[PDB]
Amino acid sequence: MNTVPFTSAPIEVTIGIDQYSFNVKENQPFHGIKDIPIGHVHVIHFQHADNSSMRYGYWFDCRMGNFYIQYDPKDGLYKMMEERDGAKFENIVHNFKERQMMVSYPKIDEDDTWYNLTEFVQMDKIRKIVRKDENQFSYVDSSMTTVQENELSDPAHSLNYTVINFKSREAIRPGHEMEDFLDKSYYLNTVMLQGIFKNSSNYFGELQFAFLNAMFFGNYGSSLQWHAMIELICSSATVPKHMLDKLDEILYYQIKTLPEQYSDILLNERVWNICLYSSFQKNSLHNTEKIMENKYPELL
Amino acid sequence: GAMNSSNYAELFNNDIKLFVDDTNVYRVTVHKTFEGNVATKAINGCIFTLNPKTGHLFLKIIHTSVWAGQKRLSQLAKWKTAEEVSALVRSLPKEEQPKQIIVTRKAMLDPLEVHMLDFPNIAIRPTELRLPFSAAMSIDKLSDVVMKATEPQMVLFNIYDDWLDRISSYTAFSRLTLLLRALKTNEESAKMILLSDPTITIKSYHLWPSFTDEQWITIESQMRDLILTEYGRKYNV
Numbered sequence: 001m002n003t004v005p006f007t008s009a010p011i012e013v014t015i016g017i018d019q020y021s022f023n024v025k026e027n028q029p030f031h032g033i034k035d036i037p038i039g040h041v042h043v044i045h046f047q048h049a050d051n052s053s054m055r056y057g058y059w060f061d062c063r064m065g066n067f068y069i070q071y072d073p074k075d076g077l078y079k080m081m082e083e084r085d086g087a088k089f090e091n092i093v094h095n096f097k098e099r100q101m102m103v104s105y106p107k108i109d110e111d112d113t114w115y116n117l118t119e120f121v122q123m124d125k126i127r128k129i130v131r132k133d134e135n136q137f138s139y140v141d142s143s144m145t146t147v148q149e150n151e152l153s154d155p156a157h158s159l160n161y162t163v164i165n166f167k168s169r170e171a172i173r174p175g176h177e178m179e180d181f182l183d184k185s186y187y188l189n190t191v192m193l194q195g196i197f198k199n200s201s202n203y204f205g206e207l208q209f210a211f212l213n214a215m216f217f218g219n220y221g222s223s224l225q226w227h228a229m230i231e232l233i234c235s236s237a238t239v240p241k242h243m244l245d246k247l248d249e250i251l252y253y254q255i256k257t258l259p260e261q262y263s264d265i266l267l268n269e270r271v272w273n274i275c276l277y278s279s280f281q282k283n284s285l286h287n288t289e290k291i292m293e294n295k296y297p298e299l300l
Numbered sequence: 301g302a303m304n305s306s307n308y309a310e311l312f313n314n315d316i317k318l319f320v321d322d323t324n325v326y327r328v329t330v331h332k333t334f335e336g337n338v339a340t341k342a343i344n345g346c347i348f349t350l351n352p353k354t355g356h357l358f359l360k361i362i363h364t365s366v367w368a369g370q371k372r373l374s375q376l377a378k379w380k381t382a383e384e385v386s387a388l389v390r391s392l393p394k395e396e397q398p399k400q401i402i403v404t405r406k407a408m409l410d411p412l413e414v415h416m417l418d419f420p421n422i423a424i425r426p427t428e429l430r431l432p433f434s435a436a437m438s439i440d441k442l443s444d445v446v447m448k449a450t451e452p453q454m455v456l457f458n459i460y461d462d463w464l465d466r467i468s469s470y471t472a473f474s475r476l477t478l479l480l481r482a483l484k485t486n487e488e489s490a491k492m493i494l495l496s497d498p499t500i501t502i503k504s505y506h507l508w509p510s511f512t513d514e515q516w517i518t519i520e521s522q523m524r525d526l527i528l529t530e531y532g533r534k535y536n537v
């Protein structure tokens with residue numbers, strides 16, 4: 001069980017940790033989050049009570065170091081920092097918990113949700129998409145644009161998602177124009193899986209990361225990337241069978257976790273109708289189809 | 301963006317542009333089979349690609365053999381149109397290649413954009429203009445060369461004949477669209493208007509009769525009258 005201590009909570013804020021969230025008042029005696037089921041990945045995020053503009057947060061692996069949050073009154077945000085002095089960190093963490101000043105990571109045992117959502121999400125791949133090498137954790141916010149968006153204006157603050165463009169030379173072999181546009185299998189299997197991602201686990205990892213960035217930060221370019229990586233699979237007539245079956249499970253948990261009142265802004269009507277009802281893989285997403293109909297029939 | 305009539309004069313500025321109409325690419329005759337069913341037979345078609353400033357028409361004849369053994373022909377026809385337009389562009393010297401291609405049917409946008417990936421600076425656009433280029437096969441000499449073809453073939457025409465010696469490109473396009481709209485609306489009567497006087501002839505190297513300026517005025521008013529008359533008949537006005 002790792003711990004995220006907070007120096008102070010000077011401004012009223014909604015704090016998320018993985019899929020959970022709680023509120024903290026202005027200058028409330030709040031010193032952090034304890035009892036965090038160590039992971040392979042985690043996310044702590046913020047939305048200030050007095051300005052719900054800019055949600056922002058930090059992806060982090062508890063096993064990569066000891067991390068804490070310190071509010072910065074000049075930049076006006078809660079900043080993640082690393083404590084290289086383990087003894088000092090133990091000293092704070094074995095004490096403030098003893099006081100009663102933090103809240104417990106409230107995991108239910110039956111609840112495998114967070115890891116069904118993050119199964120293929122890794123920090124080393126996260127740090128390639130979010131380029132800030134001097135830190136072991138990765139900052140994302142509501143407003144960050146993707147490299148792809150930027151090509152259609154500060155590269156340091158960009159989300160370096162893999163560029164997917166169905167009307168590009170990368171996606172379309174000369175001489176196979178119609179074939180490759182109607183059946184994206186070449187682009188999925190040779191270009192993306194063999195050439196760029198190397199395996200379907202890395203592909204699914206970026207898909208999951210994009211979904212979570214869209215849901216937790218309302219990051220629009222992340223939602224675009226999520227939908228594109230789904231559409232590429234569904235619009236391919238040839239997809240390894242293990243990928244198809246796993247895709248239904250990945251999407252199901254994402255739809256399951258989506259806030260019910262956020263469906264107008266996190267779901268693209270066109271992409272989902274195509275994948276569930278028209279595409280090559282329409283009959284390969286049985287459980288996602290079943291949850292999407294019973295939960296969001298208005299989109300379709 | 302899409303085209304229309306706010307920016308209708310732009311069609312005649314000095315950026316080269318081409319209209320592409322695909323409505324006569326896949327053409328069939330519908331008939332009844334021995335077992336009672338209904339069956340289609342394809343006949344030759346054509347892609348209509350027009351420079352509206354110069355009148356240059358690149359009429360690519362689509363021979364029926366290109367459909368042999370293919371399925372989903374109405375979809376394939378969009379992709380075949382796109383393939384031939386891209387081939388045409390590639391065969392033109394750089395200074396003759398269009399800066400814009402305007403498709404008369406929005407279903408052509410994706411096929412053409414995909415075939416035009418090598419030309420990122422060529423804009424592919426739809427239009428909100430309703431254009432009557434589907435009636436191109438009412439022009440006798442165009443119909444004849446399409447129906448007589450035994451192999452894929454490109455034929456070049458100036459669809460304005462010699463009009464640009466005397467009028468502007470804007471005026472010539474308006475005359476062309478008026479003529480074709482009349483032929484689309486009431487073809488037999490439109491042809492009669494044009495051919496009513498045998499002393500006015502079509503030159504071997506032209507598509508339309510050699511009217512004088514004053515005769516074109518009269519012809520244009522008879523075509524307007526034809527289109528208006530048919531509107532009233534259709535809607536009981």
Ligand SMILES: O=C(O)C1=Cc2ccccc2OC1
Nearest residue numbers: 005006007068083088089092
């Ligand atoms: O050295 C550290 O890592 C910390 C110092 C500190 C002090 C009080 C509350 C939280 C803190 O966060 C951790």
